[PDB]
Design a binder for this molecule. Structure first.
Ligand SMILES: CCCCCCC/C=C/CCCCCC(=O)OC[C@@H](O)CO
Ligand SMILES: CCCCCCC/C=C\CCCCCC(=O)OC[C@@H](O)CO
Ligand SMILES: CCCCCCC/C=C\CCCCCC(=O)OC[C@@H](O)CO
Ligand SMILES: CCCCCCC/C=C\CCCCCC(=O)OC[C@@H](O)CO
Ligand SMILES: CCCCCCC/C=C\CCCCCC(=O)OC[C@H](O)CO
Ligand SMILES: CCCCCCC/C=C\CCCCCC(=O)OC[C@H](O)CO
Ligand SMILES: CCCCCCC/C=C\CCCCCC(=O)OC[C@H](O)CO
Ligand SMILES: CCCCCCC/C=C\CCCCCC(=O)OC[C@H](O)CO
Ligand SMILES: CCCCCCC/C=C\CCCCCC(=O)OC[C@H](O)CO
Length: 445
């Protein structure tokens, strides 16, 4: 008796991640529209450009937090508690938004989820490997099944949450996200005790006595320096929300900039164009929940259904393409930098495609939802070529997990350029921009 030929414990982690991704992407599907709403009532004193920038940097921090959660679990708290307490903080983040508050709750919600996802996201995948011996040939299948559960949650969430927001408002919809995470915790907690190794209740590589102090010092210097920067910023008058957002953008981009300059000082050099292509691809893919969400709400005949449902197309196409590419890579298979190149080209085509309706019809009307369907089909096609390979090429493993954070940080700057007047230029310029760089990468391949 198995779960698709895998140890029964996979069923627990499958559901755990399905519900967490439900909570996360359910929130993402309506958070931007929610900020627009708070703005329209005068409760939130920012522009839509800033709100769009917030969504991008929010994403950026979540991915950044993810590069740290594995360490904290491996060295300090253990993978099993990390997942649990991460789940708790994620649940509380969605509760904060469900409470009878407005803009005052946004920061607290954002922080809780950044930290919680940081503890949960890397460590659930770790525990999946825990199910198998070193020997097990079933590993690749088990992770594929796990990924399917991730995509499932991401798929149903905007449908269910978006419908709920339409029927019962934002606060109820945010509560559904919280309940989703809660369900994830129930199944995880009770299902875990039956199936998970008690070894992972504790860290597997705990700090040795002599490691405690320098780690505390290292963490301390970072906080003091970051706090110092913020003090100076407020002294010299750089203290607006766009300013803090720029600071985090700089931070998110500096980290890979430093580790490279650190490590360089020589095939690492060859990894640079790969890393650049990854950042750019993630930038475009992550604009689906920001720029494309804006386009869906302003430029699409979506009178008969919640416009947040467009967020379901991303994981839908992942699920549709997946068994195909599963087959395709079994049946000369192109190289890895070739995949990145063609992978970035498809991202570029997805934005080039979106420039068409504005150029043909104008930007003051509404167009068919099919334009967005086509756009997402194109970008996810690019994801099938880049994501399954990116970790393999880089084998700096962290560099791979950071490419998504840098793309989002870059987006935090770029998405402020998008509006009805700049629609066609935005899509053409960046669409073509990414296509040419994918052409360059073929030359450098
Ligand atoms: C996996 C590869 C797929 C590539 C996607 C490209 C195919 C479709 C592109 C967009 C279709 C155009 C819209 C069709 C339509 O019914 O237009 C009606 C009109 O209301 C438009 O405003
Ligand atoms: C152990 C805790 C787990 C449970 C998760 C927390 C969620 C439980 C109940 C959520 C109640 C929804 C909020 C109701 C509400 O504010 O109504 C909004 C009002 O504006 C109606 O339009
Ligand atoms: C080890 C990697 C991290 C190192 C970070 C390097 C530099 C950190 C901070 C410096 C950036 C200055 C802040 C910029 C800023 O807030 O400008 C805002 C202003 O233009 C808007 O009103
Ligand atoms: C408007 C028309 C655009 C047509 C574009 C066609 C050309 C695209 C790429 C040209 C070079 C081939 C790349 C093949 C390759 O893998 O490397 C070899 C290349 O470096 C040859 O010099
Ligand atoms: C009286 C109100 C407060 C009660 C709620 C607080 C939380 C209750 C129990 C905490 C349990 C800690 C879980 C840590 C953990 O590793 O869980 C993992 C599971 O064992 C499965 O892996
Ligand atoms: C998730 C909780 C927050 C931890 C971050 C604080 C980082 C700074 C110093 C590390 C604190 C670790 C405390 C426990 C510890 O490692 O000491 C005992 C050693 O295992 C044995 O000497
Ligand atoms: C077996 C695969 C089938 C799909 C093939 C992919 C199609 C590739 C390019 C299609 C054409 C480019 C989009 C332009 C477009 O939508 O024009 C349509 C009219 O403008 C609609 O009013
Ligand atoms: C592989 C080919 C797939 C099919 C797409 C081919 C080209 C797609 C779009 C080209 C431009 C579409 C609109 C043209 C346009 O807006 O003309 C500009 C007018 O002068 C506006 O005043
Ligand atoms: C699978 C095919 C993918 C589709 C890509 C083909 C189309 C590429 C670019 C189309 C749009 C080009 C720019 C149009 C443009 O800016 O014209 C000016 C407008 O009239 C004013 O904004």
């Amino acid at each position: 008796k198995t779960f698709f030929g895998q140890p029964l414990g996979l069923s627990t982690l499958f559901m755990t991640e399905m519900w967490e991704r439900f909570s996360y992407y359910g929130m993402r599907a309506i958070l931007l529209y929610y900020m627009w709403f708070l703005i329209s009532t005068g409760d939130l004193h920012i522009t839509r450009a800033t709100a769009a920038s917030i969504m991008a940097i929010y994403a950026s921090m979540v991915y950044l937090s993810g590069t740290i959660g594995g360490f904290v679990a491996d060295r300090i708290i253990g993978a099993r508690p990390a997942v649990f307490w991460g789940g708790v903080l994620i649940m509380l983040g969605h509760i904060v938004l469900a409470l009878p508050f407005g803009a005052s709750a946004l920061f607290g919600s954002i922080i809780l989820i950044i930290i919680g996802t940081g503890f949960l996201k890397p460590n659930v995948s770790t525990l999946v490997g825990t199910l198998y011996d070193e020997h097990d040939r079933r590993r690749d299948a088990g992770f594929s099944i796990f990924v399917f559960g991730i995509n499932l949650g991401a798929f149903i969430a905007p449908l269910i949450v978006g419908a709920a927001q339409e029927a019962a408002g934002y606060h109820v919809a945010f509560s559904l996200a919280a309940i989703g995470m809660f369900i994830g915790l129930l199944v995880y907690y009770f299902g875990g005790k039956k199936t998970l190794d008690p070894h992972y209740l504790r860290p597997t590589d705990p700090l040795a006595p002599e490691e405690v102090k320098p780690l505390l010092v290292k963490v301390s210097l970072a906080v003091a320096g970051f706090i110092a920067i913020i003090v100076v910023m407020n002294l010299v008058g750089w203290n607006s929300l766009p300013a803090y957002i720029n600071l985090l953008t700089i931070v998110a981009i500096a980290i890979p900039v430093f580790y490279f300059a650190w490590m360089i000082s020589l095939r690492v050099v060859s990894y640079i164009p790969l890393f650049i292509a990854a950042v750019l691809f993630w930038a475009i893919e992550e604009q689906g929940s920001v720029v494309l969400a804006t386009f869906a709400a302003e430029r699409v005949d979506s009178s008969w259904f919640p416009v947040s449902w467009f967020q379901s197309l991303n994981p839908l196409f992942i699920m549709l393409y997946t068994p195909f590419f599963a087959w395709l890579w079994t049946a000369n298979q192109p190289s890895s930098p070739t995949k990145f190149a063609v992978g970035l080209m498809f991202a570029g085509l997805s934005f080039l495609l979106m420039a068409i309706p504005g150029a043909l019809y104008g930007t003051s009307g509404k167009v068919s939802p099919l334009w967005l369907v086509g756009s997402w089909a194109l970008v996810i096609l690019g994801e099938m070529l880049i994501s399954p390979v990116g970790l393999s090429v880089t084998t700096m493993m962290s560099m791979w997990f950071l490419s998504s954070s840098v793309g989002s940080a870059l987006n935090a700057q770029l998405v402020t350029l998008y509006n009805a007047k700049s629609e066609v230029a935005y899509f053409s310029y960046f669409g073509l921009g990414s296509v040419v760089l994918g052409i360059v990468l073929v030359f450098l391949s």
